[PDB]
Amino acid sequence: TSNFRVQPTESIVRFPNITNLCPFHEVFNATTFASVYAWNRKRISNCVADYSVIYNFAPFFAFKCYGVSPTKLNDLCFTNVYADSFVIRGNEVSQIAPGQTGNIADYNYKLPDDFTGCVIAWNSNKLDSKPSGNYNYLYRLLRKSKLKPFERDISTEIYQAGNKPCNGVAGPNCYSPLQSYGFRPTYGVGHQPYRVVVLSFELLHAPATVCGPKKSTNLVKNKCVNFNFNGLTGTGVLTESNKKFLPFQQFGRDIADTTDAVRDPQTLEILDITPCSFGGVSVITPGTNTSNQV
Amino acid sequence: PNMTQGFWENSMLTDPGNVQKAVCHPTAWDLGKGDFRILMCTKVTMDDFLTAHHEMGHIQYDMAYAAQPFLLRNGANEGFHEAVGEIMSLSAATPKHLKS
Amino acid sequence: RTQSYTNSFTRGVYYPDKVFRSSVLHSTHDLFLPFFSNVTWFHNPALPFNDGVYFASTEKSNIIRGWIFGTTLDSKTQSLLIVNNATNVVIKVCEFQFCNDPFLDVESEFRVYSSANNCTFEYVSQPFLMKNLREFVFKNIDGYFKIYSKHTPINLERDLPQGFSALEPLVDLPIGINITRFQTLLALHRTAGAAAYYVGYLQPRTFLLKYNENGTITDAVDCALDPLSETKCTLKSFTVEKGIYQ
Numbered sequence A: 001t002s003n004f005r006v007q008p009t010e011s012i013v014r015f016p017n018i019t020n021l022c023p024f025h026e027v028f029n030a031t032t033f034a035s036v037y038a039w040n041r042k043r044i045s046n047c048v049a050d051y052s053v054i055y056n057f058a059p060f061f062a063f064k065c066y067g068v069s070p071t072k073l074n075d076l077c078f079t080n081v082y083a084d085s086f087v088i089r090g091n092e093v094s095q096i097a098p099g100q101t102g103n104i105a106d107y108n109y110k111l112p113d114d115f116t117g118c119v120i121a122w123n124s125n126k127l128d129s130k131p132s133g134n135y136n137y138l139y140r141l142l143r144k145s146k147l148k149p150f151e152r153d154i155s156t157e158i159y160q161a162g163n164k165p166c167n168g169v170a171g172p173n174c175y176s177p178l179q180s181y182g183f184r185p186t187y188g189v190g191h192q193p194y195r196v197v198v199l200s201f202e203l204l205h206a207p208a209t210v211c212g213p214k215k216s217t218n219l220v221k222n223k224c225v226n227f228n229f230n231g232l233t234g235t236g237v238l239t240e241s242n243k244k245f246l247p248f249q250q251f252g253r254d255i256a257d258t259t260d261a262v263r264d265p266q267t268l269e270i271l272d273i274t275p276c277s278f279g280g281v282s283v284i285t286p287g288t289n290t291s292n293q294v
Numbered sequence B: 001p002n003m004t005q006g007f008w009e010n011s012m013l014t015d016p017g018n019v020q021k022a023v024c025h026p027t028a029w030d031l032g033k034g035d036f037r038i039l040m041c042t043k044v045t046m047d048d049f050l051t052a053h054h055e056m057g058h059i060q061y062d063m064a065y066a067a068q069p070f071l072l073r074n075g076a077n078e079g080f081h082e083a084v085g086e087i088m089s090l091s092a093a094t095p096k097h098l099k100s
Numbered sequence C: 001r002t003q004s005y006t007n008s009f010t011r012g013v014y015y016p017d018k019v020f021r022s023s024v025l026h027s028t029h030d031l032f033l034p035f036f037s038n039v040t041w042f043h044n045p046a047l048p049f050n051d052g053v054y055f056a057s058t059e060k061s062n063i064i065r066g067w068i069f070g071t072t073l074d075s076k077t078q079s080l081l082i083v084n085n086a087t088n089v090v091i092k093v094c095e096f097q098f099c100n101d102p103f104l105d106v107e108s109e110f111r112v113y114s115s116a117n118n119c120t121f122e123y124v125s126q127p128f129l130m131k132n133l134r135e136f137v138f139k140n141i142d143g144y145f146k147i148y149s150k151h152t153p154i155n156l157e158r159d160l161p162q163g164f165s166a167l168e169p170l171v172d173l174p175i176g177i178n179i180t181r182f183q184t185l186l187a188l189h190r191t192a193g194a195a196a197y198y199v200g201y202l203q204p205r206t207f208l209l210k211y212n213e214n215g216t217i218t219d220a221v222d223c224a225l226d227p228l229s230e231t232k233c234t235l236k237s238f239t240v241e242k243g244i245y246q
């Protein structure tokens, strides 16, 4: 008549542990973000990117994601991640965005037209402001031409707005391009120093090696369960196995090219897989003329 | 708009008294770069209330023209600034406002 | 330096995929070094990488130290360096401008490379190298650079011993750079020195691999080598009975 099959009760996922974590506590909490004219270009790769710590850091004045969805930040994987750290004023935060033009945007740092990532900003009046004044931070307000996206300029040539060569000295129509922010505790919001770290995500023709951390569920044994072991998916009953694997081997297959054993990613243990019970169902019946019992 | 948290923190609206020595002429200060303060030894009187209105009118003017360049960061002529103060002072003392 | 030649015998077989098979004859199509193929013995500055390479070193002093891989071997194109010192193995994927003749002083690596303008990747691991024959297989497939290796005790003999030593995968790296030529770096003391290494080139082949009870490749058959091997591959059995087989 039909087939009888035991449905899985629970779903189990086992992935290798996340002992590798991206250096988010290095791009943030660096205690010195240099200046916007010379922005720190840090490469983040070959690590699991967990945004839980990023949320667990200080409340963000501006956390806007353009290319990568805030929900899918962990889901999406990228080959390389670039974080740019710099200190800018409150009103200069808006200029760091796609399609926005301003002094900082054109002469210091330009987000590309098709930028993918999230702009992270938070207030830094406590650390970056001193009563004497934080003259260390600088920005550029004079330059010959607009900067192309993702460019760094650190060379100070006396701006020749006039018709006569400056000869490398300051004077009439000869101004040093660099100008200093001054940060004091009494400054109002909008001129207070703001710390911005721009997360840039790029896809390259290579393995991503940067996938958000993936959760692990407790192992269920001797029960019909759905299982996803390090990318190997199936339905079955997981039992203890006498078989001994080699260190590099992770799966086991039989003569029929079907999976029969799997090595548990977290604790190295060989678990044999038995297909969940299935079988035909037959109805033994005397003639319905005689009786209806079966 | 309404006053800044920095304004509330830095401004001295009450007479310190005792050891502290200060001038008690009311003044609204636009120190620059987003700092606004009132230097006023304010007591609980109707004249002090109206003077507070006048000074906060000054600060609202200063906040409004903050965006413009430094040289132009002033009233259009010498009269408009105290005029903007005085209109608020006049409106504050109206019996309708007092009853409200 | 000295292009002599030798017979490879049944050497260079490795585990194709990370699966466990017990008492199974499995047929796999992959890049393998063909059996009884001539292998160059060194005792063109950059040896062509081709699809893959098989490198063998038998010196007791372990004087060989690392390898170099690149497309054009200049600052223009990305390159790969593997340096194995006594403590740990260092793999650096950087656009390396190398010396025309790379070698190391080993307490210094200055003699090796001229410049490293940008570094794409880095890795540090336990040292690879440990009457001992060290065999390595290098191949870059679908963007992953794979290194298989084996360390076999060999009795004193003139050539590669006749036996099966399956090479166990050591390192898989997601470097993703094109590799056209390679070179072997040698440790010289600033003293004359001599080292001998075997180079063979892998080819697309079909192999029949025997896995014993404990999942080790005990034996292998190269299908295209000889008619009997083709018969064994067709029947999928090492033992072939009397008869005529298409």
Ligand SMILES: *[C@@H]1O[C@H](CO)[C@@H](O)[C@H](O)[C@H]1NC(C)=O
Pocket (backbone or CB within 6 Å): A015, A016, A017, A019, A265, A266, A267
């Ligand atoms: C997961 O954590 C345990 C310790 O709790 C550790 O023994 C195990 O090796 C970790 N997983 C991996 C894949 O390293």
Ligand SMILES: *[C@@H]1O[C@H](CO)[C@@H](O)[C@H](O)[C@H]1NC(C)=O
Pocket (backbone or CB within 6 Å): B002, B003, B004, B005
């Ligand atoms: C006053 O200013 C704060 C911001 O400082 C704002 O949140 C609030 O809505 C404003 N108005 C009132 C009625 O508090």
Ligand SMILES: *[C@@H]1O[C@H](CO)[C@@H](O)[C@H](O)[C@H]1NC(C)=O
Pocket (backbone or CB within 6 Å): B019, B020, B021
């Ligand atoms: C005034 O400033 C001096 C420093 O010049 C400081 O010691 C003092 O505490 C301040 N206040 C008063 C009431 O003197």
Ligand SMILES: *[C@@H]1O[C@H](CO)[C@@H](O)[C@H](O)[C@H]1NC(C)=O
Pocket (backbone or CB within 6 Å): B096, B097, B100
């Ligand atoms: C202004 O609006 C408030 C809203 O609660 C009201 O209480 C007050 O009476 C109004 N004032 C006048 C003068 O209409």
Ligand SMILES: *[C@@H]1O[C@H](CO)[C@@H](O)[C@H](O)[C@H]1NC(C)=O
Pocket (backbone or CB within 6 Å): C085, C086, C087, C088, C090, C107
């Ligand atoms: C081996 O190389 C590593 C590279 O980081 C270095 O730290 C270590 O000191 C070296 N050891 C010796 C013995 O040369």
Ligand SMILES: *[C@@H]1O[C@H](CO)[C@@H](O)[C@H](O)[C@H]1NC(C)=O
Pocket (backbone or CB within 6 Å): C095, C117, C118, C119
């Ligand atoms: C990274 O390497 C590439 C190689 O083509 C080079 O063009 C680029 O300038 C390097 N990055 C930096 C920041 O120098």
Ligand SMILES: *[C@@H]1O[C@H](CO)[C@@H](O)[C@H](O)[C@H]1NC(C)=O
Pocket (backbone or CB within 6 Å): C213, C214, C216
């Ligand atoms: C597998 O078992 C046999 C004995 O049955 C033993 O000789 C062999 O060494 C085992 N495999 C390995 C890799 O040790």
Ligand SMILES: [Zn+2]
Pocket (backbone or CB within 6 Å): B054, B055, B058, B082, B085
């Ligand atoms: Zn006034």
